[PDB]
Design a protein around this ligand. Structure first.
Ligand SMILES: Nc1ncnc2c1ncn2[C@@H]1O[C@H](COP(=O)(O)OP(=O)(O)OC[C@H]2O[C@H](O)[C@H](O)[C@@H]2O)[C@@H](O)[C@H]1O
Ligand SMILES: Nc1ncnc2c1ncn2[C@@H]1O[C@H](COP(=O)(O)OP(=O)(O)OC[C@H]2O[C@H](O)[C@H](O)[C@@H]2O)[C@@H](O)[C@H]1O
Ligand SMILES: Nc1ncnc2c1ncn2[C@@H]1O[C@H](COP(=O)(O)OP(=O)(O)OC[C@H]2O[C@H](O)[C@H](O)[C@@H]2O)[C@@H](O)[C@H]1O
Ligand SMILES: Nc1ncnc2c1ncn2[C@@H]1O[C@H](COP(=O)(O)OP(=O)(O)OC[C@H]2O[C@H](O)[C@H](O)[C@@H]2O)[C@@H](O)[C@H]1O
Lengths: 80, 401, 400, 390, 400, 51
């Protein structure tokens, strides 16, 4: 309503599972354009997750199916 | 003197109809300049009468040289203030453009003395305007009754009432501040109040799970709002406004330069920077475009083109009902049948002759005043029965003969 | 005065019957040439009177040489105009083939003079036909009431009302425009307006209204013309008056195909007319639906096609009709005495049916257009209980 | 030269970008006086040049006695011919009210001349203005494709496109009539057409055929006001027979508060009501989520439109594409001290710092015809002539 | 010679194309007078020869006095026979109305000779016209095949086949009464047969779970239709018609009644007779304006302007398909290429030259006859192509 | 025409889902760039370059 506004974030997916050093991500479909500007749609890329205090850096490994659904597997390498 | 669809209906049917209209989803009211007469206000005829008997040389200059006001209309009191203001502004524009100097200074006196009489008639209490607890007086009883009756009739899960007005006075806020109700008008802050269009969509909520509130729209501005050079609108209190910029206007002469924003003119689209005026009318136009809507009109003299156009085009929706109060209906009917009549008199007669059961007109002189309108509204029934055994008691009541 | 199923009926039951018949799925009306007499129209007898007053030598030529009209029938004003145009056209077509010129000219004159009188009776306002805001006058008071009452008795989910007519005049259009309601008649566009048969399937909708109807002119209109290119265009009243109507009315110019109208008995003579077929197809599709009601007013029952269609619609057990005929009693008598005209036999045959789906109303001046509109009801906004209130007065009868 | 926040792009990336934008929820277009020059139109500079060398016997009075036009602007051909007419109408009204015949007779010639020059450039077909099927000619060939591939792209369930125009000629009506679609402009009826603002909330459906919307921001040749205080509409032929024919082929006459073009009589409360609605609708549409706007033929010489457009960029879901031909010529003048307000405004949008504004420049590469080709793609005559032969 | 858009294709592709067109939503057939010549009929140019060989005295007065026929058309045998009877009837009616006694006998003497010639060429069996079981003969073998093939390839929830014809003989009725199929022609009753135009929207169904019926539209009338003393149209049987009015027409030499018969297109000026003719044309026009229609044309000479105009206008719809048979393509192509021939040849060659994939034209003399037309249509799999009933019937008859 | 589509990516391997022998080359339309691949063994393929 007033001047104050908070949220400004452009995400591509959210975490859906953890299996002992193995992360699953479900990709958004309602995003007309993921531009903020960087593109990460290919294995070998670097992505980051925000956990309030630190930022966790990961690396993409696989993509697959199962308006269908798309999934991503990633591994961690550190934090900033 | 009550018509619905061109026919006639009696008092009991009218009251039964009015009771059912207050149970709909959306209810609102639009008030004019005659609704504040019982509090101390006055209309435009009184403004013209006061003007003519305090500035005679200006009236002579208006009648003789510039030929803006006729000699007959001045005596019979048929002059319209808004058109006169528009014409004076039009003359001043060309005077500025052609760089003529004497007439440019001449018109400023008229255009400044004309606003002073409008401002003096919106105080309603004279010198006691800069004081607290003004709503405790007996002159504001029916406003409080109106607010209470409007608020009490709503059921849980429904929307809040809406109030529209075209007056500059504070008769409706003083009454609400004496009951404890909160009115939303689009301002926030205490030490610096500003206008935000986005905060017309706010409602209360209880943390452990202040339930009464309403809205107020001022279409032609207010006596307390003023615009700074930063093109932003600010609000103050009555005492501060009286002690800072509306004490020099009255007691001292020729000191009005855009001090407080008001719209007393006929054409309000000329100002191409004012966005409060365009914000209020969008909300007004959005309200009457919803199903199950009821509207009451009181005190409005039907002399504004924009409102008349809005009302007429909203009658093509089969879920819109209006009730219009007008004291002098018989004179208008008689005068129109002779082929003449004023422009304001044609609009009300046109509505009265429609063949739709969604239009009702109430006339009768003193029976169509504000106090009668407030008294026609109903009181809620708190604990209703199925009325299958109480009606039996009513039938049994009186048959001993 | 009121008969239902061949038996007499009273007024109180008639009003209740009419009320319940406006709640069905489909409602429509059909208006004739008698419904425009309260606005300034004329019937076929006045046309014959004007023709025999203004042209005294063509009447003598018709009566003496060619023997198309008998003297005694002309004296009593009992001659049919629609059955004379066809004979005149037949004579002209025969005379043109064998190359006779003097006999050919005399029939062109007769046809032009007869069309001229028919055109004059469809203006309703004289020289004021070309002005604007003609629906504000007091003459068109009951047309607005009819439109409002028809358009207000519609619950959501139902279909819009339909109006059929056989007139050439602009009465419904004038009444509706002054009210603010839009009517669909098959035309679209402003600078170039044309006929489109598939425009009858359109309807309104709200992006986030509901007030419209359909109009079918079965016998053409006075503001339509065909440009010989198998297309039909529509123009305004002022444009038509400036283009061709003035020459016909005042300059006595020889008649041509300036405007397409259908006066006559056999409407299939004009082969290249594709609007008549579409109109009658739409008319025939209406009466084959279940839960249908139809009100008829101002119709003299003199058209073969219409009363041939109506008779076949009574084989569906969901179709009801109400017929307004003033001179019922005079038509009853002449049938038992040997028989009247072909128009006076159909109404008596319809009256004597044995189904509770035909209602005939007579009574002279109380079966008129103004009386017909008053019988229609207004909708009820908020219903009531009627169980607690109606027993309040039950006390009075035992204490009075 | 195609820029995006100071960067550069090639043809293929822009051609994919325009396709990506067309699949959004709301789509709109805004035209100008430059989009009608391919059919026989003109521009403000051309009409001012024609006025200067046709009536030089009274151009002095507009600079000396009344002070309506600036000498520098007159010499540089940079006058705004829309405000001058409104000022002249105000002057004439005041003079008539004061009963000053000498000054009243002077102002009936300036308007009679100005309207004569303005109306000639808007007919677009000479004396063929009163005939039928004018939209079937080859001049109006590219106007039809715009509508054809603006309507076709939209999926079922999507809204209808919007077209905003500053012209006052019948260029988009003839094409739409010949295509076979219906445009909603706010009028209804045949024998008496009137302005109802609430018709902009209507749509068609099938009981068991498309449309669009058209907003005119400066009026039209077919709109006028009669003795009754209402606004009417007529057709081309009726307008030509009533008032348009005499304006061009007569020496001197003036009517008064009659015509509604171009933005002339705003001092009457009946005529400003129709100008205000278009502006408020444009403002309401510009501030919606997930919208796009394509601008073509606009010189950026209007103060209020710039304020409206700039204020609407505070939201992330508002995209703008601009077609300004003289881009580098403006930057060169910006480098030096001089320039103009339009140039200063347009160059500012070039130096922005976000990927929302896209300015396209060049020579002939940014005209109306080039814009049409960027949008994605969507025997009767033989049969007609065969039937006519029979 | 097969053309599809100006190019040639072989027999196998044509058969494949025909197979695909028989599984659409709507299927219809229009036949002419050349399809009944294999049963005992005659073409339209074989009647003029007989008339001008048997009656050489009236021909001079029919050209030199009333100008009803041209010398060029008569010398080349290109006279429209059914277009002369209507004009003759109009002349006779005018002469009777205006009381020209000497002119009535002449027109009563030429009509008696025209009907005597047209009637004798439509019996198809001579004096075996009043008998029974006329469909068992070998002449009507292919009509049965056509009717059986049309019905037996429709899936459930689909429309019924329609047949249009310009003949007025009783071949199709005889063929259908032998297979056991029922045809709708617009009449109902046994003791008083009457015409009802609303019975074209009816169909049969089974009360337990048949779909064996079709529609027949006759565009020029029939031998068995007549108008009695009242104003109605009745239908009778072959024997009753023969005993009532056909025997006198064929045998007696001084017989003519008036506006009694309804063939061929004769008494159109009466408004109770032309109403029958108009409905058939209207419903023909309504049929071919449907989304997925396919039409087969055989036996037609393309000498009618109205049918050609209707067909041409219906092709501006991207889902209409036409197949035409005309066994004289070469003799028309040469004549149009050199100087230009007759109107029918010009129309057919212009339609052939079109570059559409919707129009297909087949020629080649005896390769484009009615008999060859049947085999191009598909044959159902489950149809019993054997003989089992006849042996049992003969064995039953042998008993006792 | 087409022979299939892509269902997954695993490192530097491509899986094609059928609706033609090892050594053949295939191409993928990626808008501004065309990607060429080589068949090795649903079928598997690797990447070589782009055109
Ligand atoms: N006690 C009363 N109670 C109710 N109505 C009354 C009373 N006394 C008079 N009236 C009626 O009140 C009606 C209106 O009196 P007017 O002063 O003419 O109202 P307006 O038409 O100027 O409208 C007011 C504003 O409209 C404009 O836009 C400007 O902003 C104006 O300020 C009359 O019909 C009285 O009979
Ligand atoms: N005020 C009235 N209100 C209602 N009906 C009236 C009134 N006054 C008279 N009538 C009745 O209205 C009827 C008028 O009779 P006609 O003019 O022959 O009616 P039509 O429209 O069928 O005939 C016109 C032809 O137009 C087409 O070409 C068709 O072929 C028609 O034959 C009488 O019953 C009057 O009593
Ligand atoms: N062939 C062309 N194709 C495209 N653009 C062109 C072409 N030719 C010129 N241009 C460009 O188009 C521009 C046209 O300049 P003007 O006609 O004065 O601009 P306007 O139509 O906005 O001015 C009138 C309105 O604007 C004001 O507010 C007035 O009050 C009116 O409301 C040229 O400068 C070129 O850049
Ligand atoms: N055995 C045959 N099989 C098939 N076609 C044949 C055969 N023999 C001849 N033909 C062809 O059959 C055709 C003979 O056509 P005609 O009978 O004269 O003409 P119509 O029946 O259309 O005349 C009636 C209509 O025409 C009027 O104008 C009215 O408008 C009527 O509606 C030629 O193509 C022959 O080659």
């Amino acid at each position: 309503m007033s001047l104050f506004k908070l949220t400004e974030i452009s995400a591509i997916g959210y975490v859906v599972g953890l299996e002992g050093e193995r992360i699953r991500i479900n990709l958004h479909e309602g995003l007309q354009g993921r531009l903020a500007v960087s593109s990460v749609t290919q294995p070998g890329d670097l992505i980051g997750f925000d956990a309030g205090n630190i930022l966790v850096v990961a690396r993409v490994t696989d993509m697959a199916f199962v308006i269908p659904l798309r999934q991503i597997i990633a591994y961690a390498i550190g934090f900033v | 003197s009550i018509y619905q669809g061109g026919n006639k209906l009696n008092e009991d049917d009218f009251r039964s109809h009015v009771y059912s209209l207050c149970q709909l989803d959306n209810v609102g009211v639009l008030l004019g300049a005659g609704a504040s007469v019982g509090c101390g206000g006055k209309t435009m005829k009184d403004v013209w009468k006061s003007f003519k008997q305090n500035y005679p040389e200006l009236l002579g200059a208006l009648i003789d040289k510039y030929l803006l006001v006729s000699q007959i209309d001045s005596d019979n009191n048929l002059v319209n203030v808004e058109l006169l203001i528009d014409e004076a502004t039009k003359f001043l524009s060309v005077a500025k453009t052609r760089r003529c100097e004497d007439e440019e200074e001449e018109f400023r006196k008229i255009l400044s003395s004309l606003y002073k009489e409008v401002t003096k008639a919106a105080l309603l209490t004279g010198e006691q305007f800069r004081e607290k607890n003004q709503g405790k007086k007996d002159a504001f009883k029916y406003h409080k009754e109106l607010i209470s009756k409007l608020i009490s009739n709503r059921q849980p899960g429904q929307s809040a009432p809406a109030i529209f007005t075209t007056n500059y006075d504070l008769a409706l806020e003083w009454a609400a501040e004496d009951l404890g109700i909160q009115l939303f008008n689009g301002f926030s802050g205490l030490h610096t109040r500003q206008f935000y269009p986005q905060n017309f969509d706010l409602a209360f909520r209880n943390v452990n799970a202040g339930h009464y509130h309403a809205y107020l729209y001022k279409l032609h501005g207010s006596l307390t709002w003023y615009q700074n050079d930063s093109l932003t609108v600010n609000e103050v209190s009555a005492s501060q406004a009286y002690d800072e910029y509306i004490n020099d206007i009255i007691n001292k002469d020729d000191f009005y330069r855009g001090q407080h924003l008001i719209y007393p003119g006929a054409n309000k689209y000329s100002h191409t920077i004012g966005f409060v005026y365009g914000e209020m009318f969008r909300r007004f136009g959005e309200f009457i475009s919803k199903p199950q809507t009821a509207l009451f009109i009181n005190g409005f003299g039907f002399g504004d083109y924009h409102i008349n156009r809005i009302i007429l085009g909203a009658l093509l929706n089969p879920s819109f009902h209006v009730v219009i109060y007008y004291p002098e209906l018989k004179e208008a009917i008689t005068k129109v049948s002779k082929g003449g009549g004023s422009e304001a008199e044609k609009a009300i007669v046109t509505l009265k002759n429609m063949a739709f059961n969604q239009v009702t007109v109430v006339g009768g002189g003193s029976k169509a005043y504000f106090n009668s309108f407030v008294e026609h509204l109903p009181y809620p029934v708190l604990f209703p029965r199925d009325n299958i055994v109480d009606e039996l008691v009513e039938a049994i009541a009186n048959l001993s003969k």
